[PDB]
């Protein structure tokens, strides 16, 4: 950490050059030189450096990750002047509050909106269902209907959560319920529609913000979904871009996850009070906000000056209209796991292998809890506790009864993994082990592999390798082997039993 | 394997096995085949393990909740009687023995719990559970206990649990949702808390079982007991005026026992499948009455129950409690429910206590690292490589979270950390480095605690607490010996950190 | 009643033409012609005519009012043999079972379901709370979101029973004596949502069955709540009608009352055996039920020939799903008064005099057993009681209702001079004694409170409010003409206390 | 102006110590100048509402808290405004009893609860159950004594047996009583009354016994048990009977639940000297010296004053009175409690007398305790004159559908002279459409008029033989012996459709 020098980290899509302009003011007025940086994977880099203590004095990101930073104790509580707090909008202050207190300054409000090329299409579509027909017409014109980032779930979530997509629910002060709104039938229908667009060649699964932004600038795509920050890039090469309400899906308006752009001061900051004064009386000024808006538009702001200055703009007004229909993203620490699961679900479903139901099912199990410097084996635990395994005291996880000395011995000989529940090591007793072992799933493990991966593993003629039918036990004909590859049906191996389905067994009759 | 020309019947010891044997002696003279009826200990646990071998009984007698799990395992044979025999037996009794749209057992009789009271010791039965604590103190002066019933088995303790709640596995309509189990419900906690408070106030003892409770009531030592119809024969043999009435209400709510249907099942591996089927099919007034004489079978399911058995007031009282209660499900998951509730009731009665914790662990161990590697599923990667006959250098693995194919280095890393393999949907899975790093950073609740009681620490290190030295949790001050005595009196478990087992200043907030 | 011809009554929404064609089969095969007539208010007509002995041989109606008919003796017991009992579904026989004896022949199961036009609205709303927003969007297009019959409580009940609204308690308990759940919070919330839909111009209170049916068929309204009987008329119009589950209210699924079409026999029917054969062996056949379903769909029917035959139809599965969420309607005699009370409350709640809490409050008191003995002639006064019993009042023996003590001769006389009306308990005439009369007279002294609106007050006294004298109850000072007009503008009533009209002055108008 | 000024008039029940209260008042007169007068009026619970309406009556009324709430609704009782120090001097739960509509209405005095008084010499071991008493009476009757004698003419003494197995009364739920949930018809109340009437049928008790007969019997040694409160202990102390206080006997394995009553004092709203009456109650009566004076004449029981109660709690009689109270429940202060007592008293008196069964008497008492049937006009011309309107112009609304009656409907209502309906305190009528529906569902229409045979002969001045009677089922003219069978079996004949009917011997049992 460096004192007398201010280090600011901001996302690349936001205007880092504009923030450098308001920083030069602090360098001449107070004599404190300030550096504005745009690190890649800013949401991932900050927790790693914050644990060591090093990192940026100020960090700019959405408030959802800030709540997890506060639970991690990696950020410092901000202190308003009370009267200065009254100037900013209350709902932005409410979003930067996690379990009380205040974590970050409410800089701006950001929401997704549909951007359409007026020259390519004067009348924007108001429903998702009519978009597939538009792509058929535009591909003949050398254009694409819709191109937007599929790598990040932020852009794809409104379609998923339009019909349902709870993703935790508020219940009179209860939010982070075990129930996750990713397996609801509405979320399945939304992702199925998105996957169907890629399968019907209306969209490409390998599309990121760089490919989609350039296509709209080049005029290749007619529609795209992005936030306020892209407006400046489209302005450089104006394609008659317009901002409209996100399309309705299944009679339901798309619900975007609104994000409050926030600035947080690092907990181990030498210029903590110095950076607090700079954000309070330099960046928050209308002069400072317009400079960052010049490089990349910030959209909706919490400042009272913005309420009359920039709220009149139709693009900003349409962004707020989409925001009111949507719901602000929660600041709970479990949000990072929710983003990772949905990101994994959207990408996997688009590529293949995992169906929409399969990807969302795994997302629910990953988001609710994790199986997971905790000793995995018994000998490691004995050394840290400084007790021999002959003298160690263990308790079964199921019955919470002390293990017998023979039961403790058998656990180490079998080289079993220690199970942790409620932050306490636990083992298994012989009685509970036998009952739960005979529950089911006995020798049920199946090594299912695609034929393409099987060809890479062994090479050689696949026909010479015999894969007898699961029921017929018939040596698979070369045509039956080819059918699995054509229909994308994974071959199954149970112990030493590589098995496939014959044509008669494949179809029910 | 299982012999032919004879029928092997298994029934519990509490049931009247002599009466069933007499029916078989009649079948021996009429059909020419002697049949042997046995009363094995833990027969509900012994039947599944022997049935897979082929050894075991031709007919098994138990409640329908365990039979549904046997049907999914296939250790059960279908029943051929159609509408002619279906109409003779009561319709609702056939509904309980139907699993997956196919009948799985013969509905012999219906059983339900009830309250038995000594009319001479207690002329008028109590109407609510809360009267019993005050009644015990009055009866204690006379030298007699108020109530004694089996606490080792959860079937007897359930009616108090589900009185104000206790949804158990049963949920939804026409189906049961395994995710929602009503064992952590507040009504279930209030019922079990009364039972624990009954034991804490010395009105009941936790070590009491079926034999201890039945002896005291028949010998006149206890005024009330909770038992089914089977105990009436032994109580009638003893010279005690006894009556059967509705179970007491809890918190103004009806006590709900799990209604059970005594059923007859045919082992799938039965050479005499049709022979044993005809013996059960041709369930008659003469056959069921003989078993009822030895030990009452409750309300059977045929004409005999409609006429002679219905006249008994005790049978109607058993049916009255059955109406207040709910019929127990036939789902295979019921075995884990009974095991989890049994362990919860015993630990809450004495030891772990914490009815909230005991029911919480029961919820986790009933709703949804340790298994044998030779059979079942391989524990670690080397065993999986050997069974699949593929070297670790050529094996293909998929991450459980992202399903992306593991890199060869990641496959090597998994084997060296000796990480235990995770199986989802009966398929081997590993973890990729990206998911392993992300999921390890989240959910930080300290590495471990290893909380242990002070009495166990004296046994672990031989030295008493006077010789032992402990440090303060946050002030880092050596604990006074008087502070150690507070922990034992307050039942507080010390915690071990860095091999240092860890004052009054921080003891109270 | 004519002996030979069989008289059958069925409602107009049902298929009367299909029922007549099965009767034409009875006329050709067996030589007995039956006549089916569709009568208006057939639910009310049959109890009237059956007491006189007249009426139809077979009556077709839901099983709710059949229990009250059987208690009155209008219906007759039916025995169809066990083989026919096995042919029909068992739960259908349970609906026609009153006091063990079967009172009618179950025909079909009917339940309400949401009908929506896919062209006007491709995806139906999942929740009731979404309907207000859909109407505003559809209003700009010139269409209305939802229109259904508000005059009959059958269509309004699903919203009432979502968060509560239980007509009677559990089936074993049934009537738990004044356990009617029409004043509960769930019933109050459902009615308040319906009133809010009308007050926010989404729906109209004057809407009836014919108005709502025409709007959906002409494409004017997008959604309507109707049963299977209306499908034929909707199918006649070229409309992409879809049957789906009713929307959710307060996170709770709508609970439609499930009905079963049943056929009962009049007690004074000569051709009892002829009626049984026509119902058992002609109407309740695959061909007989098909004829009635062709004219008007019957929904899920009781015969097991129905299985797979109509169950494959997607509309039928949606009707059963709405039926399984709802509860089967009771067969107790008190159901007739319950339907009248909810109808009165819903009609009152949709219009004025609609505190919603008040409309459901009076419905709770009307559903429970009570009467003020305003009947004509059961004698109402003492002289009429003496005349019917052929005794003089000087010698008549009477008993007090509260204490059951025999009335003194002076107490009997005082009862007649005061012209006190007789009170009937357990069907026995009773009066009152002086001690009980004095005690219960001094129990409540709140006095009469005659509350009238300003417009009705002006009509009654044939004078303007300004010329009429009204005093503020607390101020005891004459009200200003502007103050009296404030009551009219605020729709607040004037009260007559102790023969003096009262109101709230401007100083007392605000909270003080 | 009807009430006197410069003096304080106090009304207290005769069972309480009126003379001891006067001694405290003489101190008030000596210290100041009031000349207070205490009176023990007969039926003061009924007299106070009658006298308070005209403005007259006592300056202070002494009675239990149950009827004081009904006086507050009638406006006869003034509000109580004590300082927080005085409220701390009295016990908290006693203040909660006098709280009606969230405001205090009277000054708590003492707590009262029924107990069992047993002659220790005659009955060394007090019975613990009610079922023991029938066998014990037969033993004492051989000894020339009676087991139990207690007042049966007042429901306060008979209720503890009634509430043991049931006795819902008005029921308690969310801290507010529910008038609709009246529970005197439950099987628990039926069991207690059945045991009570069986004690009278088996000649263990007499149905005509009252307070004076039971008190004199225990004082003279003729009976060995009585159920009475703390006020009677003084007169038993004058008698040589050793006597003692123990818990009430159990019934059906349940403790007898008495109604707890808190003696209280309220000031009439139409009374001067409100501060003078407040001064006497707060600074003279409710003192350690003042409460002792009333206790000497007749024991008040556990007093609300914290200083004196802990001193008199040494008396095992007071602790036994409190033990019975904790098993029971306190009396509701709602005005409907007065109707509850009248219904139970009527049923208990009827059942013990022989008229009506226990099941019949408890049924009518349940309906009497809930809804009810100068002041209200009755008949339309009375309402028209009070409202100064002709019927041609009167506007009336139907009770069921709340719709304004047409003139046609309004004329018909008065031609038929239909007695008016009143709902929610507002005059109402009935419209024709609602009238047809609710008149159709008669549910009975029998109009039975059941009368006994002896009364039938007196009514028509004709013997039963010369009066044709048909059996209800067989429709056979009754034989003269069959008519006597009804009289011997005490079965009343019924006049259905103008025809007297009486069951024949053959139809009495199953055919
Ligand atoms: Zn264990
Ligand atoms: Zn095959
Ligand atoms: Zn991974
Ligand atoms: Zn410390
Ligand atoms: Zn009377
Ligand atoms: Zn009306
Ligand atoms: Zn007869």
UniProtKB/Swiss-Prot annotation, chain A:
It is found in: Periplasm. GO terms for molecular function: carbohydrate transmembrane transporter activity; maltose binding. It holds the Pfam family SBP_bac_1. GO terms for biological process: carbohydrate transport; cell chemotaxis; detection of maltose stimulus; DNA damage response; maltodextrin transmembrane transport; maltose transport. The keyword Disulfide bond does not apply. Its main location: periplasm. Induction: Induced by maltose and the transcriptional regulator MalT. Permanently repressed by cold shock in a PNPase-dependent fashion. It comes from the Bacteria. The complex is composed of two ATP-binding proteins (MalK), two transmembrane proteins (MalG and MalF) and a solute-binding protein (MalE). NCBIfam families: PRK09474.1. PANTHER family: MALTOSE-BINDING PERIPLASMIC PROTEIN, MALTOSE_MALTODEXTRIN-BINDING PERIPLASMIC PROTEIN. This is Maltose/maltodextrin-binding periplasmic protein. The gene is malE.
């Amino acid at each position: 950490i460096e004192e007398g020098k201010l280090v600011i980290w901001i996302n690349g899509d936001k205007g880092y050059n504009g923030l450098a302009e308001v920083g030069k003011k602090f360098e001449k007025d107070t004599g404190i030189k300030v550096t504005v940086e745009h690190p890649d994977k800013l949401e991932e880099k900050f927790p790693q450096v914050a644990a060591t203590g090093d990192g940026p004095d100020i960090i700019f990101w959405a408030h959802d990750r800030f709540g997890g930073y506060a639970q991690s104790g990696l950020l410092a509580e901000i202190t308003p002047d009370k009267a200065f707090q009254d100037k900013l909008y209350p709902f932005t202050w409410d979003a930067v509050r996690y379990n009380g207190k205040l974590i970050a300054y409410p800089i701006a409000v950001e929401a997704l909106s549909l951007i359409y090329n007026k020259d390519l299409l004067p009348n924007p579509p108001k429903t998702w269902e009519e978009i597939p027909a538009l792509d058929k017409e535009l591909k003949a014109k050398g254009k694409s209907a819709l191109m937007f980032n599929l790598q990040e779930p932020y852009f794809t979530w409104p379609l998923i959560a339009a019909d349902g997509g709870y993703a935790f629910k508020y219940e009179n002060g209860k939010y982070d319920i075990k129930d996750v709104g990713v397996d609801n039938a509405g979320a399945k229908a939304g992702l199925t529609f998105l996957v169907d667009l890629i399968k019907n060649k209306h969209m490409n699964a390998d599309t990121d913000y760089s490919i989609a932004e350039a296509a709209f600038n080049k005029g290749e795509t007619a529609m795209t979904i992005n936030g306020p920050w892209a407006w400046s890039n489209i302005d450089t090469s104006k394609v008659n871009y317009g901002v409209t309400v996100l399309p309705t899906f299944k009679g339901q308006p798309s619900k975007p996850f609104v994000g409050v752009l926030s600035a947080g001061i690092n907990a181990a900051s030498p210029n903590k009070e110095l950076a607090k004064e700079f954000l309070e009386n330099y960046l928050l000024t209308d002069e400072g906000l317009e400079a960052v808006n010049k490089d990349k538009p910030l959209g909706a702001v919490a400042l009272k000056s913005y309420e009359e200055e920039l709220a009149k703009d139709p693009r900003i007004a349409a962004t707020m209209e989409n925001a009111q229909k949507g719901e602000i993203m929660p600041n709970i620490p479990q949000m990072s796991a929710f983003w990772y699961a949905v990101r994994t679900a959207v990408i996997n479903a688009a590529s293949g292998r995992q169906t929409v139901d399969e990807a969302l099912k795994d997302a629910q199990t990953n988001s609710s809890s994790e199986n997971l410097e905790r000793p995995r084996k018994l000998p490691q635990l004995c050394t840290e506790l400084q007790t021999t395994i002959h003298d160690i005291i263990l308790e079964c996880v199921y019955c919470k009864q002390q293990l017998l000395r023979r039961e403790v011995y058998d656990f180490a000989f079998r080289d079993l993994c220690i199970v942790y529940r409620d932050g306490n090591p636990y083992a298994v007793c012989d009685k509970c082990l036998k009952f739960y072992s005979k529950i089911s799933e006995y020798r049920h493990y199946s090594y299912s592999l695609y034929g393409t991966t099987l060809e890479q593993q062994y090479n050689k003629p696949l026909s010479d390798l015999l894969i007898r039918c699961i029921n017929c036990q018939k040596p698979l004909s070369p045509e039956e082997k080819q059918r699995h590859l054509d229909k994308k049906q994974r071959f199954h191996n149970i112990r030493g039993r590589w098995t496939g389905r014959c044509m008669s067994c494949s179809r029910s009759s």
